[PDB]
Amino acid sequence: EVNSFSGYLKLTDNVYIKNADIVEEAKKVKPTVVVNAANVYLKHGGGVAGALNKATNNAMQVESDDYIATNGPLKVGGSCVLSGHNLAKHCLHVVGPNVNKGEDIQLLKSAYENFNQHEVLLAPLLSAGIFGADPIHSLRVCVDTVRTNVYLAVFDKNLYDKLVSSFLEMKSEK
Ligand SMILES: Nc1ncnc2c1ncn2[C@@H]1O[C@H](COP(=O)(O)OP(=O)(O)OC[C@@H]2C[C@@H](O)CN2)[C@@H](O)[C@H]1O
Ligand code: NA
């Protein structure tokens, strides 16, 4: 019922990847945890964050505003667990560094560390879009940091092929 993932490519024992839209995957799989690539104020404008919020008919944004009002912003590299609304049981909002604003790229390791508190997650590549991190570097940090089962949704077919191709070089390099 829950967590019925299909059609993924196995990269390691715990990291999987698929050329798919993350919202479509969540609707098909009804996962326990879906990952949002967030900013510290939980303002869902564009990217994965906008996609998930629209699919919840803006419920995610209202909940986030309420969370922020009570608790204040997240830290870069931090996370919070909120409702997954109609897409998942829970949504893990993770804030990767915004390299375009000069934030420290090493904090991407902190962001993916949050994945290790959940048995299985559907997730995007953190900081690889609006936040300006290299998608390949984001995959490297994911692969090196996450010990739990992470299912990565990469919607662009050209990016998917480049990531898989670059991953092979990473394994044979050392
Ligand atoms: N709907 C999508 N399904 C699967 N993958 C997606 C989807 N939309 C974007 N992506 C990809 O997921 C990766 C992460 O991109 P973003 O969603 O912009 O995340 P990020 O760079 O951490 O920036 C977070 C900001 C925080 C808010 O301002 C809105 N987005 C990139 O490779 C995107 O091309
Ligand atoms: Na699936």
Residue numbers in the entry: 206 to 379
Reproduce, without paraphrasing, sentences from the article in which this PDB structure was first reported.
In Coronaviridae, including the betacoronavirus SARS-CoV-2, the causative agent of the COVID-19 pandemic, the macrodomain is part of non-structural protein 3 (nsp3), a 200 kDa multidomain protein encoded as part of open reading frame 1 (ORF1). Evolutionarily, these viral macrodomains fall within the MacroD-type class, which is primarily composed of (ADP-ribosyl)hydrolases that are able to cleave the protein-ADPr bond. To this end, we obtained the crystal structure of the S2-MacroD bound to ADP-ribose and its analogues ADP-HPD and ADP-HPM (characterized as potent inhibitors of the related poly(ADP-ribosyl)glycohydrolase (PARG) enzyme). We identified and characterized the structural basis for the observed functional diversification of MacroD-like enzymes and provide for the first time direct evidence for the hydrolysis of PARP14-ADP-ribosylated substrates. These data suggest that SARS-CoV-2 contains a conserved, enzymatically active macrodomain that can potentially counter the host antiviral ADP-ribosylation process catalysed by PARP14, as well as alter poly(ADP-ribose) (PAR) signalling, thereby enabling viruses to escape the innate immune response of the host.
On the other hand, S2-MacroD:ADP-HPD and S2-MacroD:ADP-HPM crystallized in P21 with four ligand-bound molecules in the asymmetric unit and were refined to a resolution of 2.0 and 2.3 Å, respectively. The overall fold is identical to the S2-MacroD:ADPr structure with r.m.s.d. values of 0.155 Å over 155 Cα and 0.152 Å over 149 Cα, respectively. In contrast to this tight coordination, the other two S2-MacroD structures in complex with ADP-HPD and ADP-HPM show a different pattern of interactions, mainly due to the absence of OH substituents on the pyrrolidine ring. ADP-HPD, which retains the 3′OH interaction typical of the ADPr, is, excepting the missing 1″ OH interactions, indistinguishably coordinated compared to ADPr, whereas ADP-HPM, which lacks both the 1″ and 3″OH substituents, has greater flexibility in the S2-MacroD binding pocket. While the ADP-HPM pyrrolidine ring is overall similarly orientated to the distal ribose in the S2-MarcoD:ADPr structure, movement of the 2″OH group by 2.3 Å relative to its position in ADPr leads to ring relaxation, while only maintaining the Asn244 contact to the protein.
